[PDB]
Design a protein around this nucleic acid. Sequence first.
RNA 1: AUCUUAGUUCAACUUUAAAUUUGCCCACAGAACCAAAUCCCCUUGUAAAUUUAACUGUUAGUCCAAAGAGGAACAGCUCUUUGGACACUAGGAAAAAACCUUGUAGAGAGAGUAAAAAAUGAUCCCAAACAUAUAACUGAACUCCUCACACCCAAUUGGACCAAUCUA
Lengths: 17, 30, 156, 115, 81, 148, 86, 139
Amino acid sequence: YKTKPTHGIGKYKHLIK
Amino acid sequence: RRVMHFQRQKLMAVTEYIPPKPAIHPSCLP
Amino acid sequence: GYVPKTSLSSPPWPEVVLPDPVEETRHHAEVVKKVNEMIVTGQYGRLFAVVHFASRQWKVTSEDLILIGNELDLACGERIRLEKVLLVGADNFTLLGKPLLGKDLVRVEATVIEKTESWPRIIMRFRKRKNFKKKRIVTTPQTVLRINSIEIAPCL
Amino acid sequence: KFTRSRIPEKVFQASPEDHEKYGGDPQNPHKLHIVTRIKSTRRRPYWEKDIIKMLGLEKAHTPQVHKNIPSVNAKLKVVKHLIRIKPLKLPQGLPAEENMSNTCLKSTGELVVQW
Amino acid sequence: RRPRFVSLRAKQNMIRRLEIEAENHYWLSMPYMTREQERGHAAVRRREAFEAIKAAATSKFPPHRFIADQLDHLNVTKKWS
Amino acid sequence: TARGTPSRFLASVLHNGLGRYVQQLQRLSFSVSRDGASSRGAREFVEREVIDFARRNPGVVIYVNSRPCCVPRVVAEYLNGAVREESIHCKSVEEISTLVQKLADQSGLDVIRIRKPFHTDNPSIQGQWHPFTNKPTTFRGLRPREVQ
Amino acid sequence: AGGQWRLQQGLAANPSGYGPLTELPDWSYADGRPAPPMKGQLRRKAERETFARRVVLLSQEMDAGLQAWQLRQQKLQEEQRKQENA
Amino acid sequence: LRNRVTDRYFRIQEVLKHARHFRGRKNRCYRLAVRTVIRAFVKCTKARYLKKKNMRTLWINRITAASQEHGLKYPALIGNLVKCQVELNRKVLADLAIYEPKTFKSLAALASRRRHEGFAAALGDGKEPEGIFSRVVQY
RNA sequence: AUCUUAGUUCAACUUUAAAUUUGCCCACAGAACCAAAUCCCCUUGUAAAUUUAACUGUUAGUCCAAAGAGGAACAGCUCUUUGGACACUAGGAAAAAACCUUGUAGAGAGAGUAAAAAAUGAUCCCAAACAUAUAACUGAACUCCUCACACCCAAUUGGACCAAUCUA
Ligand SMILES: [Mg+2]
Ligand SMILES: [Mg+2]
Ligand SMILES: [Mg+2]
Ligand SMILES: [Zn+2]
C-alpha cells in the first residue's frame, strides 16, 4: 500500500539500466 | 483578487501578525 | 511620576478614594443600629417586599393581589408564607438581601382566594403554499394569591 | 474535496508551559470528563452529528460524564470544536449508597454532597 | 459590497472559541488508561445492555382480552328506576 | 383574540381574603335525566359523588332535579350575581367531578383577558415619581437665566 | 448580566441555575409545616441522582479494569516461571 | 340528494364571529374573512415572543432613564448590582424606579459604591483587602 | 433501460406490521508494480441493524466551500465528485430560500447566552450624529427557571377523533 512502511518494496524497474 | 468566504476573512483577521513593541521609542532614546 | 498638567495626563474622571475601612465599619454599625431602633419602636408605615415566587419577582404590599399561572395545590383560603424575600422597604429604610433575607427578619403572608382557568388562548400555525394550517386552543390554569401582611422583626 | 480530518498527534502533547496554565498534572491523570455542547450539530458534516448523538450530547449545554479512555477520546477529537471538556473533580470522594440523592455539581466541575 | 469588514466583536468571539478549544486540546493529551489496558473492561455491561434490547424486541405480542371489558359496554344503557 | 375580545382588570368580589375568605359559589343546580344515555355520568356523580361534595362545601346549596328528560346541565350561581352554565352531557364521572370542583373554586367574574397580573391599591410607599423628584432647587427659586 | 463574573466566582452563570433562589422551598404553610416540594426540585434531584450514579458506575468500571489488567499481567508474567523449572 | 350539509350556517359563524370587528367586506364575506382571520390568529400566536421582548426593552429604557437621573449609566447599574449579589430583575427595578424613588436612589448609590470599589481594587497592586461591599457570600 | 428524457418499469430512499441478533463509530494489522483521504475490523460510546410480509410516493433540483474536466486561469458558463444548507423552526448580515447562529414545538408582564457595528455618469445626496468618563451591557422559539406536554416539512404512509343524513 502507499500509507504503510512496506510501500515501495516491489520496485524493480530501477534495477534495470 | 477575488473575495473570500466570510469565515476565512475572520480567520485571516484574527491570525494577523502583531509585532513586538520595542522597549523604548528610538526617537527619544538610542 | 510627575507629568505637567495637560488634557490627557490624568483621565477625565475624579480620583475617588474610599474611606478607611476601620472607621467605615463603625459607621455602618451605627447606621444599622439606627435602623434597628427604628424597627423596634414601630417607626415605619406600610411596607413593600420583592417576593420571589413561581418564577417571578413580584413587588407587593399588604392587601394586594397577585396572579400565578400555575396551580398551587392549596385549598381555597389556606394561608401560606412566602419565603424568598429579596428586598423589603418602608418609607425611610429598606433592607436588601444577598440575595435573600433571613427567615426571621421578614414574614410575608398570603392567601388563596380564587383558582380558575385563564381565558382561552389560540395557537395557530400557517405556512404559505404548503397546505400547512393547524389550530389549537389552550387554557392554562391559574390562581390568585392575596397578600395579607408584611411583618418585620428587629433582628439586625 | 471535503473530507474527515485526521488531527496529527503532535497537537495533543501538553507542554511544560501548558501544565501550569490549567489545573492539571501529567502523572495521576483524571478519571472522568464532564463534557458540554456549546455549538450546533447543524451546518456540520454527518460524521459529527452521529458522534454527538452517540455521546449523549444531543441537548445543549446540559453536562454529561464520560470515561477518560482513548476509545472515547478518539470520538472527542472529532467533535472537539463543538464541546467544552472539563475534568471532573472529587474533593470528597465518590458518594456512598447514601448521599446519591443529595449530590451537586458546581460550575468549577467539582461533585460534592449536600450542596 | 461582496467583501466585508470584519469587526472587533467578531474577532473577540472567535478568540473566545479558540481558547475554549485549546483547553479541550489540553484535556485530551492525558488518558487514564492506554489502548491495551482498557480492552474488555466494559464487555459485561455492553453484553447485558444488548441483551436487554433483545429481550425488549422479542416480547412484542397482542395484549390480553378480558370478559369484564366486553361486558362493561352494556353499561351504556344503565338506568335509574 | 385580544383585540377582538373584552377585557377586565384583576379583582376580587368584596376584598375576599382581606378580612376572611368567603366562598363565592352559593348555588349549584344539577339536572339529570333518569333515562337518557347522555345523563349517565351525571347519574354516577349524583349517586356516589354529590353527597361528599355537599359535605365539603356547606356554603353551597346544591339542588338536583330529574326533569330535563333528555339533556343534563349544571348551573352555578355566585354571590356577585353571575350565573355560569356548563354542559355535562356525554361526560364521565371524573370529568364532572373535576368540573364541579372548578366551579366551586373560582369567583364568578368573567373569564376574560386579565390586563395586569398584579393589582395593588397602594402602589407607592415613598411617593409616586414626578419630574421634580431627584431634581435640585436653587437659591430663592430662580429660573435659569434670571436676574433678581 | 454578569455570567462571566458569576463563573469567575464559582457561582452558576444563570441565577436561575443552582442557588438559594431556585431550590429553597418557595412557600410553607401559615402554621409552619413545610409544603409538598415543587416539581422542578423533584426533577432536578432525580437528574442529579442519575448523574451521581453514572459517575460512580463509570469510575468503578475503570478501576476494575485496571485491577483486571494487573491480574492478567501477573498470570502471564509469572506463569512463564512454571516453564522455567524441571 | 341523499346527504346535504344541514348546518353550514354554524360553521360559517364560527369564523365570522372572529371578524365582526374587522373593516371592509372582509367582515361579512367568508372567502375574505377566513384569510384575514387566519392571519390574525397567526400574528396572535407569534406575538407573544414580541410581547416579552418589548416589555423587556421598555424596562431597560425606564431603568436607563432612572439611573441617568442619578448620574449612573445602565451598564453600571446592572453590571454592578450583580457584583453585590442582588438578584433583582428588571421588571421590579422599573417598578421601583417609578413607584419608590428613594429605594431606587439607594440601589443606585449601592451600584456606584461597588463600581468605585472595583476601580480602587483594580488600580492597586495585588490582593489588598477587598472592598466592604465586594465580599461575596457563598451558598 | 425504454420511437425514451413533459412518461413508465426496476432499483435506491420513505412508511407500516412482524421475526431475529448484532448494526454504526473505531485504534493496531492489512490493500502495486506503474496530496486530501478511502476500505476493513478487536475494543469503546451507543441502540440500532438485518430479515420477512404489504403497499404507495420521489427520481435526473438550486446555492455555498473544495478537487477536477469544458469555455481563459473569464464570461456568474456545461459536466463529475466529497460536504453543507434550502424546499421545515427561529435570531442576525439593510431588504435576504442557499452566508453566520439555532432545532422537538404549550403558558410567563422571569434569567444567562449564541451570531452580530468598519478601517485609511444618466429621476433626487441618502439614516441623523459623534474624535477620549474606565467595558461592560444589548441580543433568539438555544439553555435555566414556575407549570403543562401527542400539539411547527412537500409528495407519500400510520394512527386517534368527528360534523350532518337514513336504518335497527
Ligand atoms: Mg432575551
Ligand atoms: Mg472492525
Ligand atoms: Mg427547546
Ligand atoms: Zn522624540
